[PDB]
């Protein structure tokens, strides 16, 4: 069970047919030119903190 | 209590008048496992038969059950009031009785086969297998067997 991080910036929108899954734009502290969107099952909003298990392979609009 | 020692003192499960009465459970609740005596009954009999019910019939002896096995084979004598027992006013000899043993249904089918013996509707229904006591046999007790 490995290591790495990122964390929140600013909310945009919902997806999932049921409207549950939310993805939003967040950023990594070190080497701050780092940013791409990402879905998370739980609740987020402005300035929270992400938790994943891989480094960078993003998701998009869950049909 | 505490360390009670003893090597073979306790003839756990021990046949109290044709009843297998296992030992690890206390005596007031070991005779739950005896016919005709229930949770309350072995709280009276085993209390005025003067044996401290903090203990187990398993450990005890062949003795301190002996005077339980009489103070309720006829509780009518020493300090047992007149409704703690199944069959009051007997119904044929007036002499107040109690039904204990592999005999409870051998007396709970004594009258469950006497008004079942004289054309009384209150018996007919557990004869035909239905809930006699004016209960809605329509929605409930359907399978039951």
């Amino acid at each position: 069970t490995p290591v790495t991080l990122a964390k929140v910036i600013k909310v945009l929108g919902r997806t999932g047919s049921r409207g549950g899954v939310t993805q939003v734009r967040v950023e990594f502290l070190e080497d701050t030119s780092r940013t791409i969107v990402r879905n998370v099952k739980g609740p987020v909003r402005e300035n929270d903190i992400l938790v994943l298990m891989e480094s960078e392979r993003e998701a998009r609009r869950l049909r | 209590s505490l360390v009670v020692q003893e090597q073979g003192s306790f003839q756990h499960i021990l046949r109290l008048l044709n009843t297998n009465v296992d030992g690890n459970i206390k005596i007031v609740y070991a005779l739950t496992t005896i016919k005709g005596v229930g949770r309350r009954y072995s709280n009276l009999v085993c209390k005025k038969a003067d044996v401290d019910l903090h203990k187990r019939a398993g450990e005890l002896t062949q003795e301190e059950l002996e005077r339980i096995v009489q103070i309720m084979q006829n509780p009518t004598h020493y300090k047992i009031p007149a409704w703690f027992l199944n069959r009051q006013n007997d119904i044929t000899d007036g002499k107040d009785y109690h039904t204990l043993a592999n005999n409870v249904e051998s007396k709970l089918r004594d009258d469950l086969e006497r008004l079942k013996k004289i054309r009384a509707h209150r018996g007919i229904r557990h004869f035909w297998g239905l809930r006699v006591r004016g209960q809605h046999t329509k929605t409930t007790g359907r399978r039951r067997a």
């Binding site: - | 306790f10 690890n24 187990r56």
Partner: protein
């Protein structure tokens, strides 16, 4: 009925040589380490409560909390 009647002096040594190395033992732990049942030993653990090498914590009801002397 399954195991533990009332007796066993057969390995009665574990009365005191029980409490350290896994700091915590209490009321039901009596039935844990392949020992007993719980009706002839529910009252057992104040033999060493009054003298020995153990340590007090609680006086609830439906509970117990104890580890050895430090």
């Amino acid at each position: 009925a399954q195991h533990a009647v009332i007796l066993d002096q057969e390995k009665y040594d574990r009365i005191l040589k029980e409490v350290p190395t896994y700091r915590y033992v209490s009321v039901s732990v009596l039935v844990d380490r392949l020992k007993i049942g719980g009706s002839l030993a529910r009252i057992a653990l104040r033999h060493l409560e009054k003298e020995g090498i153990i340590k007090p914590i609680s006086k609830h009801s439906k509970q117990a909390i104890y580890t050895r002397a430090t």
